[PDB]
Amino acid sequence: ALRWGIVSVGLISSDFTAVLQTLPRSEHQVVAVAARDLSRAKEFAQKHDIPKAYGSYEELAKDPNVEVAYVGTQHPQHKAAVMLCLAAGKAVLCEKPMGVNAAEVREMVTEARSRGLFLMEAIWTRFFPASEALRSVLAQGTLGDLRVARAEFGKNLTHVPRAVDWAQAGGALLDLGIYCVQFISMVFGGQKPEKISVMGRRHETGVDDTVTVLLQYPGEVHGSFTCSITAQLSNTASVSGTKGMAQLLNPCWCPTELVVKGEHKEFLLPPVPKNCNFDNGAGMSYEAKHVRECLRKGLKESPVIPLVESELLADILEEVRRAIGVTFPQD
Amino acid sequence: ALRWGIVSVGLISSDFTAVLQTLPRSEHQVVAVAARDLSRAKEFAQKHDIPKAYGSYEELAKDPNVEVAYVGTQHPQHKAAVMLCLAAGKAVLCEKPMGVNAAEVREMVTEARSRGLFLMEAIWTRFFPASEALRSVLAQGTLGDLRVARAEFGKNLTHVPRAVDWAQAGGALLDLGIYCVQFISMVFGGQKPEKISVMGRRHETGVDDTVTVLLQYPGEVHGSFTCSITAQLSNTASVSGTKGMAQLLNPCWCPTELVVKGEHKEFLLPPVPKNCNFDNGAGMSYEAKHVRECLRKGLKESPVIPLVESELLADILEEVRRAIGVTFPQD
Numbered sequence: 333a334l335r336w337g338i339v340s341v342g343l344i345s346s347d348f349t350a351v352l353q354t355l356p357r358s359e360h361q362v363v364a365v366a367a368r369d370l371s372r373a374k375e376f377a378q379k380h381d382i383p384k385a386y387g388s389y390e391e392l393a394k395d396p397n398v399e400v401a402y403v404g405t406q407h408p409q410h411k412a413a414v415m416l417c418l419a420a421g422k423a424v425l426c427e428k429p430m431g432v433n434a435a436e437v438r439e440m441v442t443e444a445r446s447r448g449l450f451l452m453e454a455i456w457t458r459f460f461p462a463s464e465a466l467r468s469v470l471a472q473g474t475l476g477d478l479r480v481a482r483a484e485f486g487k488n489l490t491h492v493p494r495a496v497d498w499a500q501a502g503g504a505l506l507d508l509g510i511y512c513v514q515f516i517s518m519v520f521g522g523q524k525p526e527k528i529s530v531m532g533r534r535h536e537t538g539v540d541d542t543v544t545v546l547l548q549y550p551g552e553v554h555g556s557f558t559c560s561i562t563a564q565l566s567n568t569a570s571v572s573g574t575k576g577m578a579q580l581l582n583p584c585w586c587p588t589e590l591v592v593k594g595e596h597k598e599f600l601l602p603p604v605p606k607n608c609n610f611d612n613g614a615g616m617s618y619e620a621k622h623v624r625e626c627l628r629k630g631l632k633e634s635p636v637i638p639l640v641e642s643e644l645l646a647d648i649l650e651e652v653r654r655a656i657g658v659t660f661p662q663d
Numbered sequence: 664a665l666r667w668g669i670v671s672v673g674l675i676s677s678d679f680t681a682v683l684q685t686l687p688r689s690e691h692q693v694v695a696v697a698a699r700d701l702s703r704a705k706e707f708a709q710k711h712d713i714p715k716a717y718g719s720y721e722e723l724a725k726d727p728n729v730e731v732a733y734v735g736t737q738h739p740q741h742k743a744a745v746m747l748c749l750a751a752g753k754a755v756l757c758e759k760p761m762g763v764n765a766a767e768v769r770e771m772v773t774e775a776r777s778r779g780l781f782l783m784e785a786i787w788t789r790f791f792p793a794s795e796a797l798r799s800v801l802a803q804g805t806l807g808d809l810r811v812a813r814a815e816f817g818k819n820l821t822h823v824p825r826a827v828d829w830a831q832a833g834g835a836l837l838d839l840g841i842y843c844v845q846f847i848s849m850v851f852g853g854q855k856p857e858k859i860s861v862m863g864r865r866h867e868t869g870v871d872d873t874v875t876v877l878l879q880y881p882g883e884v885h886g887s888f889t890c891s892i893t894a895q896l897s898n899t900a901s902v903s904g905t906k907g908m909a910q911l912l913n914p915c916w917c918p919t920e921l922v923v924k925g926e927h928k929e930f931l932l933p934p935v936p937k938n939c940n941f942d943n944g945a946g947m948s949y950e951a952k953h954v955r956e957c958l959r960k961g962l963k964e965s966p967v968i969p970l971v972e973s974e975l976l977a978d979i980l981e982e983v984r985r986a987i988g989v990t991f992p993q994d
């Protein structure tokens with residue numbers, strides 16, 4: 333079995349741990365969990381039936397029974413935790429966005445590469461059967477010659493502290509726009525944009541509120557998206573060519589419905605766990621099973637979200653937030 | 664009764680004439696129709712039961728029984744027909760877009776104004792009960808403080824000669840984007856944009872193929888739209904604020920469904936005519952009844968689509984097509 337170590341005991345680590353404990357026991361085992369104090373770690377290990385608890389991430393990195401670390405910390409704490417785990421020879425699945433700016437991602441990627449260790453950014457949406465089916469539709473040429481595509485992700489998250497906080501690098505782009513940028517990149521074959529235009533406005537807590545981006549892609553196609561932590565949007569994503577449109581229905585970030593030229597297709601989520609902190613949390617199973625398949629094949633990154641594309645997504649996101657003057661200490 | 668004169672006998676004039684002939688006989692009468700030859704005009708007058716036919720527009724302008732002229736010519740022929748009718752003291756309802764560039768619209772508007780004559784651009788969408796209901800939702804503040812809105816209009820019209828022809832000023836912007844620009848202007852109170860960014864690509868017939876625009880509006884709100892004559896899009900339009908979203912469902916340009924914060928509302932079209940050349944053609948009744956209400960009140964333009972806003976819509980459209988190098992002889 334693939335032996336997992338859980339870094340951080342917040343809500344997302346809770347969901348991911350519950351998912352891993354629904355998978356075949358001969359394929360995945362949760363062997364250890366670290367928190368920034370032993371107390372929190374033991375409470376989590378007892379609730380989730382993990383056999384070892386640590387009060388520092390460093391102790392988890394050093395556990396020789398852990399093969400892969402899941403870094404579920406808040407956004408600004410991803411980098412140090414990843415770097416610790418890689419220095420200790422662990423594979424790492426890092427939560428999204430992998431880092432808060434382009435240089436953090438480059439640093440993590442250079443480290444993983446220099447040590448021949450697997451690293452993947454947990455962009456869970458890419459592994460949903462719906463998303464895989466859209467990629468086939470594109471490979472098959474069903475929509476004809478591409479023209480453009482548009483994604484949107486907006487909800488009123490003003491009462492979700494995580495989400496609006498400057499100190500945790502929250503705001504529309506890093507919480508929600510990350511899903512729009514990855515979708516547009518995916519439909520256009522992970523290609524670097526030729527040009528980006530941005531409009532948006534800030535939120536009174538120090539982060540961005542609502543942001544729309546236009547991206548020129550190579551071969552005369554382009555994408556746009558809108559994200560927001562105050563305004564509710566359609567929360568769909570689409571791609572259109574000369575023969576028609578494919579759409580991933582709301583919830584786009586976690587789609588189970590694909591519509592192609594008016595024809596609907598539903599992809600049910602796994603049955604458990606239910607009651608996950610986050611909508612459709614059960615769908616995290618797909619990325620978990622993907623990491624095991626990569627590691628069994630001896631791969632040092634995923635073909636579905638390669639490290640060079642994580643770097644490009646980071647470059648894009650950083651360019652967008654700089655265009656509207658939203659700077660971070662890290663940069 | 665309001666006495667109408669029909670200029671041009673194409674498909675749209677066919678639909679508008681059929682609509683007017685379903686209205687109360689004491690309110691609207693179709694008294695005359697002109698075509699560029701008598702033959703075509705008589706055939707149309709016989710099919711549509713109009714009592715007078717002319718083989719030139721000038722003869723219709725001069726008919727003292729005509730009170731209002733409906734100019735249904737192809738795009739580049741709007742200006743000369745409008746100018747002829749206004750010089751002859753007729754009110755004019757001119758089909759969309761009123762002119763092919765900003766100067767044509769300014770010229771028509773200056774002429775109407777200098778003569779104290781009603782002129783309105785036939786932006787039929789604005790008069791649908793659905794659109795009026797969205798304006799109320801906005802006036803009521805139901806969506807909270809505005810944030811942004813997005814419209815799209817795309818279909819494969821490559822086999823519709825009108826639509827792809829350079830000589831008739833076709834293409835995505837003048838055929839379909841005009842609906843997106845008017846919607847965004849309407850939700851943002853007809854205000855002039857502070858900035859416009861554009862990406863798009865040309866079509867091999869000499870006109871634009873697919874075009875996406877980002878528009879900054881005053882008060883930190885913005886809109887975007889995508890239009891295309893090759894790629895099928897969602898064909899919905901939406902506006903979102905801090906308390907939720909309103910959407911006009913497909914067909915946006917001709918909506919009968921409004922969704923506000925998840926609550927659906929349907930507005931049925933008039934029952935006749937049926938079998939109109941254009942989708943939901945029966946809805947042209949609303950703009951026809953509006954022109955009569957303006958004229959009965961002695962108004963020289965519509966408060967719903969004032970001439971200064973037609974000028975601004977034209978200015979926008981022209982700026983967008985220049986940004987992607989699509990120039991016309993007229994400019």
Ligand SMILES: O=C(CO)CO
Nearest residue numbers: 487489507585610611
């Ligand atoms: O990823 C998500 C957290 O907001 C979806 O809301």
Ligand SMILES: O=C(CO)CO
Nearest residue numbers: 818820838916941942
């Ligand atoms: O106005 C319209 C003509 O395309 C709608 O298709």
